[PDB]
Structures are given as C-alpha cells and as structure tokens.
Design a protein around this motif. Structure first.
Motif, PDB file in Angstrom:
ATOM      1  N   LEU B  35       0.822  -1.281   0.028  1.00 53.32           N
ATOM      2  CA  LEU B  35      -0.100  -0.045   0.093  1.00 53.32           C
ATOM      3  C   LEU B  35       0.711   1.244  -0.055  1.00 53.32           C
ATOM      4  CD1 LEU B  35      -2.886  -1.094   2.381  1.00 53.32           C
ATOM      5  CD2 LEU B  35      -2.982  -0.737   0.006  1.00 53.32           C
ATOM      6  N   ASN B  36       2.055   1.220   0.551  1.00 51.52           N
ATOM      7  CA  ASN B  36       2.989   2.242   0.189  1.00 51.52           C
ATOM      8  C   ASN B  36       3.877   2.175  -1.069  1.00 51.52           C
ATOM      9  OD1 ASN B  36       2.243   3.677   2.558  1.00 51.52           O
ATOM     10  ND2 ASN B  36       3.633   2.439   3.913  1.00 51.52           N
ATOM     11  N   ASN B  37       3.525   1.588  -2.018  1.00 50.91           N
ATOM     12  CA  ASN B  37       4.134   1.542  -3.190  1.00 50.91           C
ATOM     13  C   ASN B  37       4.080   2.694  -3.964  1.00 50.91           C
ATOM     14  OD1 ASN B  37       5.439   0.754  -5.581  1.00 50.91           O
ATOM     15  ND2 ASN B  37       4.083  -1.315  -5.621  1.00 50.91           N
ATOM     16  N   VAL B  38       5.173   3.052  -4.834  1.00 47.97           N
ATOM     17  CA  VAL B  38       5.229   4.171  -5.550  1.00 47.97           C
ATOM     18  C   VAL B  38       4.376   4.446  -6.494  1.00 47.97           C
ATOM     19  CG1 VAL B  38       6.847   5.724  -6.893  1.00 47.97           C
ATOM     20  CG2 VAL B  38       7.774   4.307  -4.789  1.00 47.97           C
ATOM     21  N   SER B  39       4.185   3.502  -7.692  1.00 52.48           N
ATOM     22  CA  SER B  39       3.481   3.650  -8.795  1.00 52.48           C
ATOM     23  C   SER B  39       1.890   3.382  -8.547  1.00 52.48           C
ATOM     24  CB  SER B  39       3.924   2.728  -9.828  1.00 52.48           C
ATOM     25  OG  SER B  39       3.085   2.654 -11.076  1.00 52.48           O
ATOM     26  N   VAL B  40       1.235   4.419  -8.320  1.00 53.79           N
ATOM     27  CA  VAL B  40      -0.075   4.227  -8.048  1.00 53.79           C
ATOM     28  C   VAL B  40      -0.914   4.137  -9.058  1.00 53.79           C
ATOM     29  CG1 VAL B  40      -2.028   5.166  -6.525  1.00 53.79           C
ATOM     30  CG2 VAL B  40       0.263   5.705  -5.970  1.00 53.79           C
ATOM     31  N   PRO B  41      -1.861   3.109  -9.474  1.00 53.65           N
ATOM     32  CA  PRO B  41      -2.703   3.322 -10.707  1.00 53.65           C
ATOM     33  C   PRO B  41      -3.858   3.965 -10.385  1.00 53.65           C
ATOM     34  CG  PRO B  41      -2.939   1.263  -9.500  1.00 53.65           C
ATOM     35  CD  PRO B  41      -1.676   1.896  -8.840  1.00 53.65           C
ATOM     36  N   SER B  42      -4.230   4.468 -11.647  1.00 53.31           N
ATOM     37  CA  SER B  42      -5.609   5.533 -11.881  1.00 53.31           C
ATOM     38  C   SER B  42      -6.607   4.760 -12.028  1.00 53.31           C
ATOM     39  CB  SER B  42      -5.174   6.129 -12.961  1.00 53.31           C
ATOM     40  OG  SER B  42      -5.267   5.530 -14.153  1.00 53.31           O
ATOM     41  N   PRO B  43      -7.961   5.292 -11.817  1.00 55.21           N
ATOM     42  CA  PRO B  43      -9.125   4.460 -11.552  1.00 55.21           C
ATOM     43  C   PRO B  43      -9.520   3.707 -12.863  1.00 55.21           C
ATOM     44  CG  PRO B  43      -9.410   6.515 -10.581  1.00 55.21           C
ATOM     45  CD  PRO B  43      -8.144   6.775 -11.209  1.00 55.21           C
ATOM     46  N   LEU B  44      -8.955   3.681 -13.865  1.00 54.78           N
ATOM     47  CA  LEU B  44      -9.110   2.953 -15.236  1.00 54.78           C
ATOM     48  C   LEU B  44      -8.517   1.652 -15.019  1.00 54.78           C
ATOM     49  CD1 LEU B  44     -10.502   5.178 -17.153  1.00 54.78           C
ATOM     50  CD2 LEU B  44      -8.702   4.567 -18.618  1.00 54.78           C
ATOM     51  N   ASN B  45      -7.418   1.504 -14.472  1.00 59.30           N
ATOM     52  CA  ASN B  45      -6.580   0.165 -14.495  1.00 59.30           C
ATOM     53  C   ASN B  45      -5.934   0.083 -12.911  1.00 59.30           C
ATOM     54  OD1 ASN B  45      -4.937   2.342 -15.214  1.00 59.30           O
ATOM     55  ND2 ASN B  45      -3.391   1.294 -15.521  1.00 59.30           N
ATOM     56  N   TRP B  46      -6.939   0.097 -12.099  1.00 54.59           N
ATOM     57  CA  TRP B  46      -6.586  -0.081 -10.778  1.00 54.59           C
ATOM     58  C   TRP B  46      -6.019  -1.650 -10.431  1.00 54.59           C
ATOM     59  CZ3 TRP B  46      -9.390  -4.501  -9.971  1.00 54.59           C
ATOM     60  CH2 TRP B  46     -10.608  -4.709 -10.596  1.00 54.59           C
ATOM     61  N   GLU B  47      -5.152  -1.871  -9.745  1.00 54.48           N
ATOM     62  CA  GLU B  47      -4.459  -3.174  -9.439  1.00 54.48           C
ATOM     63  C   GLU B  47      -5.302  -3.839  -8.356  1.00 54.48           C
ATOM     64  OE1 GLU B  47      -2.556  -3.934 -11.791  1.00 54.48           O
ATOM     65  OE2 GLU B  47      -0.495  -3.085 -11.643  1.00 54.48           O
TER      66      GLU B  47
END
Ligand SMILES: *[C@@H]1O[C@H](CO)[C@@H](O[C@@H]2O[C@H](CO)[C@@H](O)[C@H](O)[C@H]2NC(C)=O)[C@H](O)[C@H]1NC(C)=O
Lengths: 50, 50
Positions: B35-47
């Motif tokens: 949850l403290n990862n750097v590369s946060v995905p945007s609401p189209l391609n959530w992980e």
C-alpha cells in the motif's frame, strides 16, 4: 594374636521441614483461598514433623 | 503466645515482564509494503493483489 573389627550404629537422620502451603498452592492466591477450607490439614502435617 | 520458634511464611509476587516467544507460522503478508508502493494506478486500471 589380637584382632580388630569395626561396626556402625546409626543414631540420627536428616531433619526435614515442609512448608505445606508452598508445596500445595505455591504462589497463586485462588489456590490459597481454596486451601483455606481444608483448614486443619497443613497444621497437622507441621505438628507431626515437629 | 508461648516461648518458641515459629515458622512464618513470607511471599513475593511478579506480574510484570513477560516474554512470549511464539515461533509463528508464515511470514507476514506485508500489506503495507504494497500500500506504500510508488507507482499508484489510476481508476481505469486499478490493481489487485491476493
Ligand atoms: C510496486 O508494484 C509493482 C508492480 O506493478 C512492483 O514492480 C515490480 O518490480 C520488479 C523490480 O525488480 C520487477 O521485476 C517486476 O516485474 C515488477 N512487477 C510488475 C508487475 O511489473 C514493485 O516492486 C512494487 N513496489 C514494491 C516496493 O514492492
């Protein structure tokens, strides 16, 4: 001639004392409250050993 | 009371400084290392991780 031989006679034994409440209900207060109603059970043990 | 030698019980208690080694099962999941990862995905391609 003259012959020698030795014998051993026991006149004593080790004196053993027992703390009855420490043997039964060591440090725990619930056990001491339960043991308090046997009452005159550790005192008879102490008086026999004395 | 009479002249004598009396055996009088003293006490000590200890409630503090427990240790509790456990040998636990598996290694922690470490959710917060994701949850403290750097590369946060945007609401189209959530992980998602399981
Ligand atoms: C954050 O998440 C990404 C996944 O998108 C992790 O990226 C991986 O980084 C390693 C670096 O050696 C790559 O080999 C992997 O291929 C990457 N994975 C993917 C799916 O691309 C990244 O490690 C994460 N951050 C942390 C701190 O774990």
């Amino acid at each position: 001639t003259i012959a020698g031989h030795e014998e051993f006679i026991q006149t004593s034994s080790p004196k053993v004392t027992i703390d009855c409440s420490a043997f039964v209900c060591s440090n725990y207060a619930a056990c001491h409250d339960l043991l308090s109603e046997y009452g005159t059970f550790c005192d008879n043990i102490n008086s026999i050993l004395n | 009371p009479n002249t004598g030698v009396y055996d009088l019980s003293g006490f000590t208690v200890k409630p503090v400084a427990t240790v509790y080694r456990r040998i636990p099962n598996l290694p922690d999941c470490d959710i917060d290392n994701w949850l403290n990862n750097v590369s946060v995905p945007s609401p189209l391609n959530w992980e998602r991780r399981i």
